[PDB]
Design a protein around this ligand. Sequence first.
Ligand SMILES: CC1(C)S[C@H]2[C@H](C(=O)[C@H]2NC(=O)CCC[C@H](N)C(=O)O)[C@H]1C(=O)O
Ligand SMILES: [Fe+3]
Length: 329
Amino acid sequence: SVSKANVPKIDVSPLFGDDQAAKMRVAQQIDAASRDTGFFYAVNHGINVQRLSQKTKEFHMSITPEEKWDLAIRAYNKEHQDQVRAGYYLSIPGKKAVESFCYLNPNFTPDHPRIQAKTPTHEVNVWPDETKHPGFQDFAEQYYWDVFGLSSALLKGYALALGKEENFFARHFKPDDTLASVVLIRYPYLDPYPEAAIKTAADGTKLSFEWHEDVSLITVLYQSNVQNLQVETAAGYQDIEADDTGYLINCGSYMAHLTNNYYKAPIHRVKWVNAERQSLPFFVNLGYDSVIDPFDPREPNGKSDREPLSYGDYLQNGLVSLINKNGQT
Ligand SMILES: CC1(C)S[C@H]2[C@H](C(=O)[C@H]2NC(=O)CCC[C@H](N)C(=O)O)[C@H]1C(=O)O
Ligand SMILES: [Fe+3]
């Protein structure tokens, strides 16, 4: 058997309020989880995740092949050269089981200065026809802002955890410019499940997605109640329990850089499970020009021998590297 990873449930509700001692006690729990396996469940988060899952299922199950081509990223549709990040990521029956829909900041409109400038990593979202998917765009955009709010509260907890003022990260996480993304991932049930869509780890574990660190500051993840994630610890890969009431939280490699690996970006992977399920990450990205000076909370003077890295530089390089390492999703 594989051991169960220690993934505590942390009541994050004080991070939305004004009780500073209570927020420090949440911050300590974040610190402890970040120094241990690197994962925790945020509970009492205030988001209606059941309705998220229902609306997402309605979308995934009703979108047609025609609509998928019409929304497709450039990796699948050469006509869509502006769609690097945002749009549909098709499955390939017999070969690639997963499919997904990514969207970015709804404030990236045609008139946004970074869209006008054609700055890398910024794109205008694409949406299916309203008549075919009534209410979907509005729901999805509202979800962006709901998860943005949760993420901002979480970032206040991380800041406090690291000995900083509570706006240390949040001041760089702003509605007008955040590079954060939502991905609505569908993992299908298939009978037969094609072997070509199943990867095998060096330890023999069947996988849907190989080991990686996230490209993010933090990742704020809702999943169905089907166990699938594993985290590498000193004791080997351990199973992360599912909890479809909570959000699973981890640090990405930008946090590891800024903290000199004090809060590591945990290495994790996705087991192959032949089940119809959802994986709905929010990748908490800062603005393109956001730079936080790296530090080290283990050193008396806080100094680090890492160089400052703007978030835009980080993100553009990281997304490419993850595609090269683990394949086009
Ligand atoms: C939550 C994950 C483990 S993370 C891992 C995999 C994924 O699809 C993985 N992550 C990525 O591919 C990066 C998506 C970035 C997004 N298009 C953007 O432009 O910002 C997920 C899963 O398979 O459940
Ligand atoms: Fe991941």
